[PDB]
C-alpha cells in the first residue's frame, strides 16, 4: 500500500495506514494506539534515583530497502526535519534497488591491561603460547553462551609503549545475540589471575572495548542520475557536488564532525527505537573516524560516469543487540523489534548503516542544492 | 536537607524528598507529580511521521558542585547503574570542594566551502582584507541577535589541500543562548554571492561546524587520597591507579573510545533532561579527542604526591542551548532547566562537563577496585 501522503496525513490517519500496512499484532497496534508508555515502576528498575519519565517522539520511516528487504524503521528524535529526511532519502535510494550491506565479522573485544612487567616480550610470548587454555577459562567462566553456539575465539597480546608501558590482553568473543558487556567483564575476571601470574605484573582492569573493530558493517548504494533529478544534466551536477562534498569532509576535521553528526542523527534514532546503548556506537565510530591519522568523514560518495551513478559507501563498528534490559522492559522497544520482523542483531546492523547512509544522503543533497 | 537514601526510598517518597528539598514552584512540582509527558500533539509539531511518543527513566544526581554552587542534575538513561554512579562521584567530589570550571571561549563556527578557485592565495588575500564588510553583511542578514549583544566577530580563510583543493571561509559568531545552526545558516547564505564573486569560485555548501573549538570548556577538581578511602594507604593506591586508567586510555584507542563513552552516559543523560541535541555534542567531543594525532581519552587523572591529591580535568567543546524548539515544548525539558535554577547556556556547559569528569571519575575507580 502506498505510504505517500503519510508526513501530511494526520497523526489518528498514520496509525490507521500503518494498520492497513497490517505490520503489527493486534496487541502491538493496540499499545501504539493508546501510545503505551515505560511505567515509572518499570523506569524505576532500569535506572537508579528514578523521579519520572521522559518522553519524545515516536516516528516512522518507510520504504528502507535492505538487501532486497523493506523494512519500516522506528526513530525517535527530538529534532526537525530528521525524519522528514530519512524518509526522503529512503524512497529515493529505494527506487535506486536500495542499499546493499554486510557483515564482516560480529564480535566483542575485551581487554585487561597489565602493568609493571618486567619482561614484556617474554610475558608476551608466555601468554600466546597459553591461548586456548587462556579461551577455555573464559568460556568456562561463563558456559551460558558456549551452549548458545558462541564464546571466546582468539587472543591477543600487544605492547603498548608510553608513560608506563602497558601489556595488554584482548580477547574476542561470540555474544550472539547480546551486547556482551556483562559476559565480558566476568570471562576478563576469571583471566587475571593466570594473566598476572604468567606475565609477572599487576592487572589494572579488565573492560569490554567500545572499539568495536571485530564488528564492521558496510552499506552501498547506487544511484542513477535520473534518480536525483529529472531535469537534463541536473542529476550529473548533484552528484558531483554530493563527492565533493565528501571529499570535503575527508579533507576538513571541522566539515567532517558535522557530517559524521548527520549520520548519527538517523543512527542514535533507531539506536533508541531498538533500546540500544548509542553512547557506544557514537564512540566506536567516532574512534574509527580517526583511524587514519586524521578525524575525517565516515562514508564516501564518488560517481560512476560510464553507468551514470552516484556511489555511496559507509563501515561502521556496529555492535548491536536484541537482547537486554531495556529490550526486554520498555514496550515500545520490543514493538520495535517486532515493527521490524524481530532481525538478528546483524541484520539490525545492516539496517542500522543504511539508515546512517541514507540520512547523509539527505544531508548533503539538501547541503549542495540550489 | 540530607539527601542520603534517597537511592533506596521509594519513588513516591523520593518525590517527597525532592518536595521537601523545596526546588521547584508548586506547578513544577505538580506536574513532575502527575509525571506530564510531552504529548503526542506537540510530539507532532517536533518531529515528522510522528506515531506515538518514546519514553526513558528520568532520574536526579544531587549534590553536584560547580564553583561552589550546588545542583540537582536532571538524568535521562535507559542504563542501569549509570545514575548510581554518577550520584556517588558527585558526592565524593563535592566533599573534596566540588569542581573548577571555566568556559574559555562561547561562539559558534560556521563555513562555507569554495572550489573551483584559480588562483587560491589571492582569493584568500581579497577575502580577508574584506573582512569587516563581510562581518557587517552577516549581522545584517540576522540582525535580531546583533540587538540581544552577540552577532558575527571574526572570519579567516584557509586553504586546504586535496581532491581537491578548497578554500575554506570560517566565521565566528556570538549566538548568545542558541545553538545557532539556523543562524549560522543563514548568515552564511548572505555571504555566499560575495565569497564567490571574490574568489572567482563555485560555493559548495555554508553549514555550522559541529567541531566547536570556539566553545571549549574545562572542569577540574582535586580530591584528598582519605576521600578515597579511610583505610591507611589505601587512598593513595586507589588514585595511583586511577592515574594509571587515564595513561592507559591515552595509550590505546580501544581503551580510550570505552573511556569517552563512559564519560557520555553521563553527559548525553543531560544533555537529553535539558533539551539539547546530543549527537552534535558527541561529534564534536569525540573529534576533538584526536586532535593530537590519535584517538585519546578526553579526560586525564593526575596525582599531587606532596599534597597528597587526586587531580582530574577535562576539556570538551559544549556549545549547548537555553533556548530551542525541544525546551520550548517539551515541559520535562522546562522543568529540567527551572530545576537547575535556569542557567545560562554557559553555566550549563560548567556543570555539563562536571557530570562528565564525575561519571568518568566513578567508571575509573570502579573498574580499577578490587
Ligand atoms: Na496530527
Ligand atoms: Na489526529
Ligand atoms: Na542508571
Ligand atoms: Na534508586
Ligand atoms: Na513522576
Ligand atoms: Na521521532
Ligand atoms: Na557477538
Ligand atoms: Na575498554
Ligand atoms: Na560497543
Ligand atoms: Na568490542
Ligand atoms: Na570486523
Ligand atoms: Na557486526
Ligand atoms: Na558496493
Ligand atoms: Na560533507
Ligand atoms: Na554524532
Ligand atoms: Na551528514
Ligand atoms: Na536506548
Ligand atoms: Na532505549
Ligand atoms: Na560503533
Ligand atoms: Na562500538
Ligand atoms: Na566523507
Ligand atoms: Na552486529
Ligand atoms: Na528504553
Ligand atoms: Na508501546
Ligand atoms: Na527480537
Ligand atoms: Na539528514
Ligand atoms: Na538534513
Ligand atoms: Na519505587
Ligand atoms: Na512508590
Ligand atoms: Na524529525
Ligand atoms: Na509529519
Ligand atoms: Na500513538
Ligand atoms: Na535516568
Ligand atoms: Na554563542
Ligand atoms: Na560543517
Ligand atoms: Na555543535
Ligand atoms: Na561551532
Ligand atoms: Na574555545
Ligand atoms: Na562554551
Ligand atoms: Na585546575
Ligand atoms: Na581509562
Ligand atoms: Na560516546
Ligand atoms: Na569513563
Ligand atoms: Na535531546
Ligand atoms: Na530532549
Ligand atoms: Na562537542
Ligand atoms: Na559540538
Ligand atoms: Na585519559
Ligand atoms: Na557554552
Ligand atoms: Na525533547
Ligand atoms: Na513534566
Ligand atoms: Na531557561
Ligand atoms: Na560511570
Ligand atoms: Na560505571
Given at each position: 500500500?502506498?505510504?505517500?501522503?503519510?508526513?501530511?496525513?494526520?497523526?489518528?490517519?498514520?496509525?490507521?495506514?500503518?494498520?492497513?500496512?497490517?505490520?503489527?499484532?493486534?496487541?502491538?497496534?493496540?499499545?501504539?494506539?493508546?501510545?503505551?508508555?515505560?511505567?515509572?515502576?518499570?523506569?524505576?528498575?532500569?535506572?537508579?534515583?528514578?523521579?519520572?519519565?521522559?518522553?519524545?517522539?515516536?516516528?516512522?520511516?518507510?520504504?528502507?530497502?535492505?538487501?532486497?528487504?523493506?523494512?519500516?524503521?522506528?526513530?525517535?528524535?527530538?529534532?526537525?526535519?530528521?525524519?522528514?529526511?530519512?524518509?526522503?532519502?529512503?524512497?529515493?535510494?529505494?527506487?535506486?534497488?536500495?542499499?546493499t550491506?554486510?557483515?564482516?565479522?560480529?564480535?566483542?573485544?575485551?581487554?585487561?591491561?597489565?602493568?609493571?612487567?618486567?619482561?614484556?616480550?617474554?610475558?608476551?610470548?608466555?601468554?600466546?603460547?597459553?591461548?586456548?587454555?587462556?579461551?577455555?577459562?573464559?568460556?568456562?567462566?561463563?558456559?551460558?553462551?558456549?551452549?548458545?553456539?558462541?564464546?571466546?575465539?582468539?587472543?591477543?597480546?600487544?605492547?603498548?609503549?608510553?608513560?608506563?608501558?602497558?601489556?595488554?590482553?584482548?580477547?574476542?568473543?561470540?555474544?550472539?545475540?547480546?551486547?556482551?558487556?556483562?559476559?565480558?567483564?566476568?570471562?576478563?575476571?576469571?583471566?587475571?589471575?593466570?594473566?598476572?601470574?604468567?606475565?609477572?605484573?599487576?592487572?589494572?582492569?579488565?573492560?569490554?572495548?567500545?572499539?568495536?573493530?571485530?564488528?564492521?558493517?558496510t552499506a552501498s548504494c547506487?544511484?542513477?542520475?535520473?534518480?536525483?533529478?529529472?531535469?537534463?544534466?541536473?542529476?550529473?551536477?548533484?552528484?558531483?557536488?554530493?563527492?565533493?562534498?565528501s571529499?570535503?569532509?575527508?579533507?576538513?576535521?571541522?566539515?567532517?564532525?558535522?557530517?559524521?553528526?548527520?549520520?548519527?542523527?538517523?543512527?542514535?534514532?533507531?539506536?533508541?527505537?531498538?533500546?540500544?546503548?548509542?553512547?557506544?556506537?557514537?564512540?566506536?565510530?567516532?574512534?574509527?573516524?580517526?583511524?587514519?591519522?586524521?578525524?575525517?568523514?565516515?562514508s564516501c560518495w564518488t560517481?560512476?560516469?560510464?553507468?551514470?551513478?552516484?556511489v555511496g559507501e559507509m563501515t561502521?563498528?556496529?555492535?548491536?543487540?536484541?537482547?537486554?534490559?531495556?529490550?526486554?522492559?520498555?514496550?515500545?522497544?520490543?514493538?520495535?523489534?517486532?515493527?521490524?520482523?524481530?532481525?538478528?542483531?546483524?541484520?539490525?546492523?545492516?539496517?542500522?548503516?543504511?539508515?546512517?547512509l541514507?540520512?547523509?544522503?539527505?544531508?548533503?543533497?539538501?547541503?549542495?542544492?540550489?
Amino acid at each position: 500500500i502506498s505510504w505517500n501522503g503519510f508526513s501530511k496525513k494526520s497523526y489518528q490517519e498514520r496509525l490507521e495506514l500503518l494498520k492497513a500496512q497490517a505490520l503489527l499484532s493486534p496487541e502491538r497496534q493496540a499499545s501504539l494506539e493508546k501510545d503505551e508508555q515505560m511505567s515509572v515502576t518499570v523506569a524505576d528498575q532500569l535506572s537508579e534515583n528514578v523521579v519520572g519519565t521522559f518522553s519524545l517522539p515516536y516516528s516512522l520511516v518507510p520504504e528502507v530497502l535492505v538487501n532486497g528487504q523493506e523494512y519500516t524503521v522506528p526513530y525517535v528524535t527530538e529534532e526537525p526535519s530528521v525524519v522528514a529526511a530519512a524518509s526522503y532519502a529512503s524512497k529515493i535510494i529505494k527506487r535506486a534497488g536500495g542499499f546493499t550491506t554486510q557483515v564482516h565479522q560480529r564480535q566483542m573485544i575485551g581487554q585487561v591491561a597489565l602493568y609493571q612487567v618486567a619482561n614484556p616480550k617474554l610475558a608476551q610470548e608466555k601468554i600466546a603460547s597459553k591461548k586456548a587454555e587462556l579461551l577455555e577459562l573464559a568460556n568456562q567462566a561463563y558456559p551460558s553462551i558456549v551452549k548458545r553456539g558462541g564464546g571466546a575465539r582468539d587472543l591477543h597480546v600487544e605492547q603498548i609503549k608510553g608513560e608506563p608501558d602497558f601489556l595488554v590482553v584482548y580477547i574476542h568473543v561470540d555474544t550472539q545475540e547480546a551486547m556482551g558487556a556483562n559476559m565480558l567483564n566476568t570471562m576478563l575476571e576469571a583471566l587475571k589471575p593466570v594473566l598476572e601470574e604468567l606475565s609477572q605484573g599487576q592487572s589494572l582492569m579488565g573492560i569490554l572495548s567500545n572499539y568495536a573493530t571485530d564488528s564492521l558493517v558496510t552499506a552501498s548504494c547506487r544511484i542513477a542520475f535520473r534518480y536525483l533529478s529529472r531535469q537534463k544534466d541536473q542529476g550529473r551536477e548533484i552528484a558531483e557536488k554530493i563527492a565533493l562534498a565528501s571529499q570535503f569532509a575527508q579533507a576538513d576535521p571541522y566539515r567532517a564532525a558535522t557530517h559524521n553528526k548527520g549520520i548519527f542523527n538517523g543512527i542514535d534514532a533507531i539506536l533508541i527505537a531498538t533500546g540500544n546503548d548509542w553512547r557506544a556506537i557514537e564512540a566506536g565510530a567516532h574512534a574509527f573516524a580517526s583511524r587514519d591519522g586524521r578525524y575525517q568523514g565516515l562514508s564516501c560518495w564518488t560517481l560512476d560516469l560510464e553507468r551514470e551513478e552516484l556511489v555511496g559507501e559507509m563501515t561502521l563498528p556496529m555492535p548491536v543487540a536484541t537482547k537486554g534490559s531495556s529490550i526486554g522492559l520498555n514496550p515500545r522497544v520490543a514493538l520495535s523489534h517486532d515493527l521490524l520482523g524481530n532481525p538478528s542483531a546483524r541484520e539490525l546492523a545492516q539496517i542500522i548503516v543504511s539508515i546512517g547512509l541514507a540520512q547523509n544522503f539527505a544531508a548533503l543533497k539538501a547541503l549542495v542544492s540550489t
